[PDB]
Nucleic acid binder design. Structure first.
Length: 82
DNA sequence: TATGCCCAGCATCGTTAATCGATGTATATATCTGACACGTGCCTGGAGACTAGGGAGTAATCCCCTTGGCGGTTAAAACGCGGGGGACA
């Protein structure tokens, strides 16, 4: 029972856009959001988010460094956690 | 003289026994052919023995090619609906 949405490599521009905003709005319930390495770090920014967790290194140095870049941006007012 | 009576006389039927011949069944012998093994004779195409050499084995290095992963469009596969025309009787 935890409210979420997924962020894959398979989604229409219109549908991708709807949720990204739904998420950074002031009063959004879902604190769980799952993303891709190339599809996740693709672009965008997450300003509400503080914690980011890595299952496995992304066969390379730095795909992760941007992967955290989407969440760790100028706005975030809640430190950061990785 | 004709008509019933005595004394032979071969063919009718059936039954017994000996005989020539056909059929069925052994039983040891004399052909028929078809060999497979051996020794006869000879050739050399293989075996046996030795050499020499170059192919192929292996090992050590290289670098090209094949597989992989990924993501964007953009055609293609997929589906269905509908009804016509070919299959099949």
């Amino acid at each position: 029972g935890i409210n979420f949405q997924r962020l894959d490599g398979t989604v229409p521009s219109a549908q991708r856009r709807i949720s990204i905003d739904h998420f950074n709005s002031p009063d959004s319930n879902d604190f769980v959001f799952l993303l891709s390495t190339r599809a996740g770090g693709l672009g965008i920014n997450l300003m509400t988010a503080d914690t980011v967790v890595i299952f496995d290194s992304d066969w390379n140095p730095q795909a992760d460094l941007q992967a955290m870049a989407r969440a760790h941006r100028i706005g975030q007012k809640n430190h950061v956690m990785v």
